[PDB]
Amino acid sequence: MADQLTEEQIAEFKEAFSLFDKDGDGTITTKELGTVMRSLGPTEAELQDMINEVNGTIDFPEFLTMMARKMKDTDSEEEIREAFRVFDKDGNGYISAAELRHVMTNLGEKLTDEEVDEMIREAVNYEEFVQMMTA
């Protein structure tokens, strides 16, 4: 979904897309698409794959959908690690197991006590626990 990209990222992508291309239609050549992607801040193989995925004309929603998959993963991983490690103040990232289970059962969402016990039995660093729960 396109809702993963923030408003600032969408605005910057639109600004670069409009600045690279001249006045007229938003269609941009595949080589020009790669040049604009390089000007916006990837490998040659990734650029070729993105050009083949999207004649030779690329419009704005196509560029947004292509960049969302590349910008979502690392940002989500970093945000998850930072948010999981934000509770404890020790700085090491490995909080108490009982405290982590109590925080997961009391705050977060709506889950039964049996489900929390099963998740604790299936499960300690915060980022490691988040990555294990995501998988």
Numbering used by the authors: 1 to 41, 44 to 56, 61 to 129, 137 to 148
Pull verbatim passages from the article behind this deposition:
Each forms homotetrameric assemblies of ~5000 residue long subunits. Here, a collection of cryoEM structures provides insights into the molecular consequences of MHrelated RyR mutation R615C, and how apoCaM opens RyR1.
In order to understand how apoCaM engages with WT and mutant pRyR1, we solved cryo-EM structures of CaM compIexes at nominally Ca2+-free conditions, obtained by adding excess EGTA. In the open structure with apoCaM, interface 1 appears nearly identical to the closed structure with apoCaM bound. Using interface 1 as a reference point, there is no visible difference in the contacts with the C-lobe comparing open and closed structures with apoCaM bound. Comparing the open structures in complex with apoCaM, the differences between WT and R615C pRyR1 are much smaller.
